[PDB]
């Protein structure tokens, strides 16, 4: 029983949906909804009334809004990275270009770190506090910083991947999750490095977990569960602590006098204060009672999604996005602890909007507009919880809007 | 088997510190740290000290809750117990005791050893230690004269093994040891 | 005994200064190389004391160590010095500097000393194999061999296979030729050693003549001179059982031997300990359920419960072969539990850490309703056995009992015909039907209920209760649940007044009735009458000050609208609660007041009319209130939070998943 | 909160903890309270502890408390304290900020 709870907290007509792109991403606050058109124009539908569209034209094929858990930063076809700011004041979809970077300057900064490699491809990894991490040439994890006072972009760190060039150039994903920078190689390994120091703090054997071509991997915000989605619409999730311990070979991460000796005799270790009154507590405790990242300071196959990019993964849940032209959008939710899945089919005019923030409920842009898809919440239950939370005005609004 | 023979103090109804702790064997031992001496010695000492504390607890509780002349061959407190793995032994073992005055001599014996033989042998040994050495006032004769204990056990208790000695065989061993010391 | 001079000597041996240690090592050097006389022993004794009494390592000057090793290698040394040096090198172990060798002294007794030196090292440098091989090579010539056999035995104790097959068969033939008289010359001298390790040899590892003589020598230690006879009967039975283990045909032979022995072993006092190995042999290869096993389970413990080592043997046999228990054996051990409780009454310290394992291994379907009472009346069991001793013993032998406390009232009450059947149920050897409350016998045994042994038995009942409940809380159905609830409701304030006993049974029973209620929420619903009478009585809060909180909390929370429930039950329970609150406001503690407020205000928010009743009476109670502060504040959670009905209707009856830490983050995902 | 929480004066610590807890130093307080959860066997400390949780309630702290209150409700001794925690956890998890001050 997982059909829908498809609410809508702001409308958006299909006139703009006929102009937006196929994929989009939303700020945590309602700041924008920018979508990528196949023509290279960056359309921004401000869902913060009426909702006009803004256009940013160029050879842009990669961008990411400021995910401060909108300041759009994009890199063109000539490996020139730009930062343009859009202001949603009073519904005015007006944008301005603030910071621009040229390919010659990027190659110069790469060479100044004694890296004898010409920049052939730059793929983004993050954009936080005006500091961007980029996996340059798929090998050098150069942590740029665009500071205040128009300071030049200087790499505050540049550590070559402690791996041979055989697998260094086969990297796919560069995910920063609270500092444990993971770089996935398409052959089935994840070299968990640390952006602070650059050490190969650990290594994960995705092959030992037993297809191939790991397209992307999702890290829980607590570095607790990681789910890797390949290019074959297959996702597998295993626990970092268990996957580092249960295969620890791959993990590179009179009163006192006898008691402290129990602390240093380590072949065994007593449990010593050997009376016949405190030996009952041991029996009582036995009857009654009967992670990996600490050192580094089923399967989803819908019986073919185009881009099976899971939106976010929590400690006990996992939400994914799948879009198909034949039938529409299929949104999936996986419970990490309960191993349950809820997959709902939607209409053929709807695309995801990656909420680059804290609210990990699938906010799908439907024909009428914004739509937050939930599971298990009845309309009566939801409105009752709002009323038990606030006034009846909110209940009236949420009941009337649909 | 017998892992060890003991002489230890027994409190009256001050830690119980073994006056004589003869460990009749070793244990297999491997830590990634190179095989040391502090670790093994401290382990083989703390095990015996824990056995001594357990026998003290058994003896004291037997003393209060017996009523038998509270505070002599068959008139001394006696009993048995079982130990706990990793606290601090590997293979679990039974513990046999027989306390006289304030000198409770124990035996840590494997579960494949006779209990009644263990109690009889501990009784004969504690008679021999009370008489041959006669420490019923000069208790210094038990620590500065540990060689007498060493001789007695080396004669009667060869290498952690109990013998079914009878009158003729005890006569033979008496002919053996009696004159070896003045 | 224990002289302060002895303590001073030990303290001096422990805290000898490093410079003083170097001086003593130099003295040893200048005194051992010299003419070793009485000064040699007078210094070696002090060296042994200063090395032995120090747990932390004492690696003194090397010269002393090499001097000791060479002295062991020096044949002119006397027996005393050689033994003391062997102790020196068998105590200072284990050292990685083992300059010693395994073929350094020709003397056989000195060879034994060298073996004792070597074996105390460990497998850190492949030592044990070297010592075993060297011993075999030294024994390869004519031997004698009798002195060195204990080293062989200890080696196989610590190393089961390094004795090669050829060497193993050499040892076997040597022992067989060494078998042969009996306890009841050099030949008999080696016979004693052959008998002294037979069981370990068989476990770790002519033959027709072996079966003729040595195989029957196991029983010949007993069958084929009083204390050694007892010490040897057990060895004979254990060796017979070992032969059964190594030879399946020997199981029948040992069973027949035990059956033949049953003429006296079942009728000879002072020989009861030999049946424990017989019981083990029967279990691994079942004895007479009535005579032999009957005495082992219920016959022996009612006559000889005052021997602290026999009881250990019995209960350890019971808990060491529970894995291989059979259905009939399970029924037997489930039948005689009140008698098995006699040992826990008398010999608790060495047997409770053993019942904790045994109790979940004899749980039956309906015995729990009586087993709780059997656990409840255990200190009284000890007191009744004490009276039994005081009134049947000849004054001559009476030392094997307690006759040193207040006799006259209890002894008179023993002969009082008012209590001639209840004692025969408390002291019973069986439980085949529940008995009456022990209140009368509790008033009888006031004088002795504070004995040392009764106080001993009182401390092993809480843990056994926890074991039994945890074995039944996972093995319960509706009838069992209701019976147990009624049992606790009765026994709340009906206990033997042994000091610090009811304060523990109360805690276990109350906090586990909570566990039963959380196992089935409808317990309060099906238990209207009893709980209603209990809450309506002030005396319940005036004598059960720590169980009343539990029942009032359960009633306040488990009056849930969401098929046997009726709308008027809430009103009847509210009537009981209102009466209790009016009357009440060890008496009711500052916990009962707050729990009563909680129950009233959270039970009147499930009734439409009773909200005005709250506004009239619970509001009045708040105003009068406006552990007392908690009483005043608690009711707000269903006065202010139940004034509004929509929110209050559901919180107090939450779903099944408010506990697991991720079940609701999507329930605020509806905006 | 400096001590790990193994003292015998816990019944005296929790009173200050309740009288002072707010939304400034979250993680340290949550860790200390989690450690102290195992050292509460009598009703008095089991009410001081939920007095602390109620103080946090009133302060308005939201995240992580959905687990601190949860663990307190799931791992105490007396039923009354556990029900107290359940009610207060529900109040914090399902209320808007003002209504908690008006309906709790």
Swiss-Prot record, chain A:
Coiled-coil intervals: none
Expression sites (tissue/organ): Expressed in all structures of brain, with a high expression in cerebellum. Expressed in cortical projection neurons.
Subcellular compartments: Cytoplasm, Cytosol; Nucleus; Cell projection, Axon; Cell projection, Dendrite
Annotated disease: Spastic paraplegia 11, autosomal recessive: A form of spastic paraplegia, a neurodegenerative disorder characterized by a slow, gradual, progressive weakness and spasticity of the lower limbs. Rate of progression and the severity of symptoms are quite variable. Initial symptoms may include difficulty with balance, weakness and stiffness in the legs, muscle spasms, and dragging the toes when walking. In some forms of the disorder, bladder symptoms (such as incontinence) may appear, or the weakness and stiffness may spread to other parts of the body.
Functional description taken from the UniProt entry: May play a role in neurite plasticity by maintaining cytoskeleton stability and regulating synaptic vesicle transport.
Quaternary state and interactors: Interacts with AP5Z1, AP5B1, AP5S1 and ZFYVE26.
Protein name (record): Spatacsin
Species for this entry: Homo sapiens
Phylogenetic classification of the source organism: Eukaryota, Metazoa, Chordata, Craniata, Vertebrata
Gene that this sequence comes from: SPG11
UniProtKB/Swiss-Prot annotation, chain B:
Any single GO CC term annotated in Swiss-Prot or TrEMBL for this entry: lysosome
Membrane topology summary: Peripheral membrane protein
Keyword list, A-Z: Cytoplasm, DNA damage, DNA repair, Endosome, Lysosome, Membrane, Protein transport, Transport
Subcellular location: Cytoplasm, Cytosol; Late endosome membrane; Lysosome membrane
Pfam families associated with the record: AP-5_subunit_s1
Signal peptide annotation: none
GO biological process, one term: protein transport
Keyword Amino-acid biosynthesis (UniProt): no
Keyword DNA repair on entry: yes
Function description: As part of AP-5, a probable fifth adaptor protein complex it may be involved in endosomal transport. According to PubMed:20613862, it is required for efficient homologous recombination DNA double-strand break repair.
Subunit annotation: Probably part of the adaptor protein complex 5 (AP-5) a tetramer composed of AP5B1, AP5M1, AP5S1 and AP5Z1. Interacts with ZFYVE26 and SPG11.
Name of the protein this chain belongs to: AP-5 complex subunit sigma-1
Organism whose genome encodes this protein: Homo sapiens
From Swiss-Prot, chain C:
Any one of the GO BP annotations: autophagosome assembly
GO cellular-component term (any): AP-5 adaptor complex
Keywords annotated in UniProt: Cytoplasm, DNA damage, DNA repair, Nucleus, Protein transport, Transport
Pfam family, one: TPR_AP5Z1_C
Protein localization: Cytoplasm; Nucleus
Subunit structure, interactors included: Probably part of the adaptor protein complex 5 (AP-5) a tetramer composed of AP5B1, AP5M1, AP5S1 and AP5Z1. Interacts with ZFYVE26 and SPG11.
PANTHER family recorded: AP-5 COMPLEX SUBUNIT ZETA-1
Purpose: As part of AP-5, a probable fifth adaptor protein complex it may be involved in endosomal transport.
Protein name: AP-5 complex subunit zeta-1
Source organism per UniProt: Mus musculus (Mouse)
Swiss-Prot record, chain D:
Domain of life the protein comes from: Eukaryota
Function: As part of AP-5, a probable fifth adaptor protein complex it may be involved in endosomal transport.
Complex and partners: Probably part of the adaptor protein complex 5 (AP-5), a tetramer composed of AP5B1, AP5M1, AP5S1 and AP5Z1. Interacts with ZFYVE26 and SPG11.
Protein name: AP-5 complex subunit beta-1
Upper classification of the organism: Eukaryota, Metazoa, Chordata, Craniata, Vertebrata
């Amino acid at each position: 029983m997982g059909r829908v709870l498809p609410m809508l907290l702001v409308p958006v007509p299909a006139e703009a949906m006929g102009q937006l792109g196929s994929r989009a991403q939303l700020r945590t606050q309602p700041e924008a909804l920018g979508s990528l058109t196949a023509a290279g124009s960056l359309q921004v539908l401000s869902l913060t009334r009426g909702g006009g569209r803004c256009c940013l034209e160029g050879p842009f094929w990669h961008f990411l809004w400021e995910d401060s858990r909108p300041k759009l930063l994009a890199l063109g076809e000539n490996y020139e990275l730009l930062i343009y700011e859009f202001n949603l004041k009073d519904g005015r979809c007006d944008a301005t270009i603030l910071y621009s970077c040229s390919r010659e300057a990027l190659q110069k900064l790469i060479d100044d770190q004694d890296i004898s490699i010409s920049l052939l491809s730059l793929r983004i990894l993050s954009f936080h506090n005006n500091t961007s991490l980029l996996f340059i040439n798929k090998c050098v994890i150069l942590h740029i910083i665009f500071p205040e006072r128009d300071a030049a972009i200087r790499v505050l760190n540049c550590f070559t991947l402690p791996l041979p060039a055989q697998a260094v150039d086969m990297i796919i994903d560069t995910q920063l999750c609270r500092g444990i920078l993971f770089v996935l190689s398409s052959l089935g390994w994840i070299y968990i490095f640390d952006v602070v120091d650059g050490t190969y703090v650990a290594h994960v054997d995705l092959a030992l977990h037993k297809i191939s071509s790991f397209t992307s991997l999702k890290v829980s915000q607590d570095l607790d569960v990681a789910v890797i989605v390949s290019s074959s619409n297959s996702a597998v999730a295993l626990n970092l602590n268990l996957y580092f311990r249960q295969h620890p070979g791959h993990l590179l991460c009179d009163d006192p006098v006898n008691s402290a000796y129990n602390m240093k005799l380590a072949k065994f270790s007593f449990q010593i204060d050997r009376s016949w009154k405190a030996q009952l507590s041991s029996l009582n405790e036995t009857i009654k009672n009967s992670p990996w990242f600490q050192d580094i300071l089923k399967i989803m196959h819908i019986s073919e999604p185009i881009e099976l990019k899971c939106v976010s993964v929590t400690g006990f849940t996992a939400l994914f996005t799948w879009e198909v032209e034949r039938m529409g959008y299929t949104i999936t939710l996986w419970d990490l602890e309960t191993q349950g899945m809820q997959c709902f089919s939607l209409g053929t005019k709807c695309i995801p909007v990656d909420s680059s923030g804290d609210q990990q409920l699938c906010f799908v842009l439907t024909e009428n507009g914004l739509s937050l898809i939930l599971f298990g919440l009845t309309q009566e239950e939801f409105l009752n919880r709002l009323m038990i939370h606030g006034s009846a005005s909110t209940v009236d609004t949420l009941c009337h809007l649909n | 088997m017998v892992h060890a023979f003991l002489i230890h103090t027994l409190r009256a109804p001050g830690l119980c510190r073994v006056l004589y702790s003869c460990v009749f064997g070793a244990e297999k031992s491997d830590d990634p740290r190179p095989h040391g001496a502090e670790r093994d010695r401290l382990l083989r000492k703390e095990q015996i000290l824990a056995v001594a504390r357990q026998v003290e607890s058994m003896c004291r509780l037997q003393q209060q809750a017996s009523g038998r002349p509270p505070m002599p061959l068959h008139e001394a407190p006696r009993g048995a117990f079982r130990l706990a793995a990793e606290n601090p032994f590997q293979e679990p073992r039974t513990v046999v005791w027989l306390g006289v005055l304030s000198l409770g001599f124990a035996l840590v014996l494997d579960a494949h050893e006779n209990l009644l033989l263990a109690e009889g042998t501990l009784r004969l040994l504690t008679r021999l230690l009370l008489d041959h050495l006669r420490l019923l006032a000069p208790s210094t004769s038990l620590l500065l004269r540990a060689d007498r204990i060493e001789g007695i056990l080396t004669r009667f208790l060869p290498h952690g093994q109990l013998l079914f000695l009878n009158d003729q065989f005890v006569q033979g061993l008496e002919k053996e040891f009696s004159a070896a010391w003045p | 005994a224990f002289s302060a001079g002895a303590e001073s000597l030990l303290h001096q041996a422990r805290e000898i200064q490093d410079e003083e240690l170097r001086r003593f090592c130099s003295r040893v050097t200048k005194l051992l190389q010299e003419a070793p006389g009485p000064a040699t022993v007078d210094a070696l004794q002090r060296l042994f004391l200063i090395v032995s009494a120090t747990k932390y390592p004492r690696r003194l000057e090397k010269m002393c160590v090499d001097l000791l090793q060479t002295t062991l290698c020096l044949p002119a040394s006397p027996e005393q010095l050689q033994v003391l040096c062997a102790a020196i090198l068998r105590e200072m172990s284990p050292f990685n500097d083992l300059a010693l060798s395994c073929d350094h002294t020709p003397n056989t007794r000195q060879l034994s000393l060298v073996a004792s030196v070597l074996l105390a090292q460990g497998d850190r440098k492949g030592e044990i194999r070297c010592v075993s091989q060297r011993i075999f090579k030294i024994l390869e010539n004519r031997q004698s061999v009798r002195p060195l056999l204990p080293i062989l035995s200890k080696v196989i104790g610590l190393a089961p296979g390094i004795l090669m097959e050829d060497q193993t068969n050499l040892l076997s033939k040597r022992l067989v030729d060494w078998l042969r008289f009996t306890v009841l010359t050099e030949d008999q001298w080696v016979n004693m050693q052959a008998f002294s390790m037979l069981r370990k040899w068989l476990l770790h590892s002519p033959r027709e003549r072996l079966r003729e003589v040595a195989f029957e020598y196991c029983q010949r230690l007993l069958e084929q001179d009083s204390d050694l006879q007892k010490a040897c009967l057990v060895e004979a039975v254990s060796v017979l059982d070992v032969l059964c283990r190594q030879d399946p045909s020997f199981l029948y032979r040992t069973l027949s031997c035990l059956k033949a022995l049953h003429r006296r072993l079942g009728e000879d006092p002072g020989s009861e300990r030999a049946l424990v190995p017989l019981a083990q042999f029967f279990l691994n290869h079942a004895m007479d359920a009535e005579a032999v096993y009957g005495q082992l389970l219920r016959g022996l413990p009612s006559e000889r419960f005052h021997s602290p080592t026999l009881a250990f043997e019995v209960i350890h046999f019971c808990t060491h072969n529970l894995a291989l228990f059979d259905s009939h054996f399970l029924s037997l051990l489930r039948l005689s539990f009140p008698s098995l409780f006699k040992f826990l009454a008398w010999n608790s310290p060495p047997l409770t850490a053993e019942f904790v394992v045994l109790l979940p291994a004899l749980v039956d379907a309906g015995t729990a309703v009586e087993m709780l009472h059997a656990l409840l009346d255990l200190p009284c069991l000890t007191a009744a056995l004490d009276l039994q001793l005081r009134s049947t013993q000849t004054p001559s032998e009476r030392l094997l009992w307690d006759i040193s406390l207040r006799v006259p009232s209890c002894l008179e009450a023993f002969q009082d015909p008012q209590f001639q059947g209840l004692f025969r149920h408390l002291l019973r050897t069986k439980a085949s039907g529940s008995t009456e409350r022990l209140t009368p016998l509790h008033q009888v045994l006031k004088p002795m209920a504070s004995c040392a042994r009764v106080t001993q038995c009182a401390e092993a009942v809480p843990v056994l209760l926890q074991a039994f409940f945890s074995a039944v809380t996972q093995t319960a159905d509706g009838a069992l649940i209701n019976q147990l609830a009624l049992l606790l409701l009765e026994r709340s304030d009906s206990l033997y007044p042994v000091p610090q006993y009811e304060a523990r049974v109360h805690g276990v029973l109350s906090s586990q009735l909570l566990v039963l209620c959380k196992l089935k929420p409808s317990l309060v619903v099906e238990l209207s009458r009893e709980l209603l009478e209990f809450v309506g009585s002030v005396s319940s809060i005036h004598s059960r000050a720590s169980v009343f909180t539990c029942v009032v909390w359960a009633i306040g929370e488990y009056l849930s609208v969401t098929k046997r429930c009726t709308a008027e039950q809430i009103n009847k329970f509210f009537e009981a609660l209102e009466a209790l609150l009016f009357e009440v406001t060890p008496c009711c503690p500052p916990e009962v007041v707050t729990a009563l407020m909680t129950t009233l205000t959270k039970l009147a928010s499930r009734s439409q009319d009773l909200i005005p009743r709250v506004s009239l009476f619970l509001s009045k109670m708040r105003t009068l209130a406006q552990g007392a502060e908690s009483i005043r504040t608690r009711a707000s959670e269903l006065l202010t939070l139940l004034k509004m009905p929509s929110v209050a209707q559901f919180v107090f009856t939450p779903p099944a998943g408010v506990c697991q830490p991720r079940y609701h983050r999507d329930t605020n995902v509806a905006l | 909160v400096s001590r790990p929480g193994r003292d015998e004066a816990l019944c005296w610590h929790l009173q200050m903890l309740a009288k002072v807890a707010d939304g400034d130093a979250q993680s340290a307080t949550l860790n200390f309270l989690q450690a102290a959860a195992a050292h509460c066997t009598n009703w008095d400390l089991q009410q001081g502890l939920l007095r602390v949780c109620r103080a946090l309630l009133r302060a308005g702290v939201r995240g992580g408390l959905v687990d601190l209150l949860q663990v307190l409700a799931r791992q105490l001794e007396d039923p009354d304290g556990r029900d107290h925690a359940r009610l207060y956890y529900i109040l914090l998890a399902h209320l808007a900020a003002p209504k908690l001050g008006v309906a709790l």
